[PDB]
Amino acid sequence: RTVMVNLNIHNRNTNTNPKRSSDYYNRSTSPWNLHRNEDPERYPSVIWEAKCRHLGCINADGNVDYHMNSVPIQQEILVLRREPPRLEKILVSVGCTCVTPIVHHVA
Ligand SMILES: CN1C(=O)[C@@H](NC(=O)[C@@H](NC(=O)c2cc(Cl)c(Cl)[nH]2)C2CCCCC2)COc2ccccc21
């Protein structure tokens, strides 16, 4: 039911320095690696998702504390998918945080 938009530089990645962000977040007690989620039937075709590096959280000494748990923060965002092969909502991991597990550790 919706119409026209211009796909250009104002709606695609122009960040050429991802290491600036990763070096900064690598100082987190719950740091993360990145999954390159590519789907050619989707706009952005590439979505970078956080994958927690550790099961526990990194302490002041540089060691892992297994009393805590590094966990993916989830968010729901909109993506365009090709119609015919349309606006779709998807759940994505946006980063990691350090939590005190109430029941189990998310692995
Ligand atoms: C690591 N990384 C990113 O995250 C990039 N972001 C995106 O390409 C796209 N957003 C994500 O993927 C994203 C959003 C959420 Cl919410 C999660 Cl989760 N993921 C973004 C591009 C611009 C249009 C809208 C989508 C930007 O910097 C980079 C540069 C080079 C290589 C990797 C990265």
Ligand SMILES: [Cl-]
């Ligand atoms: Cl890429």
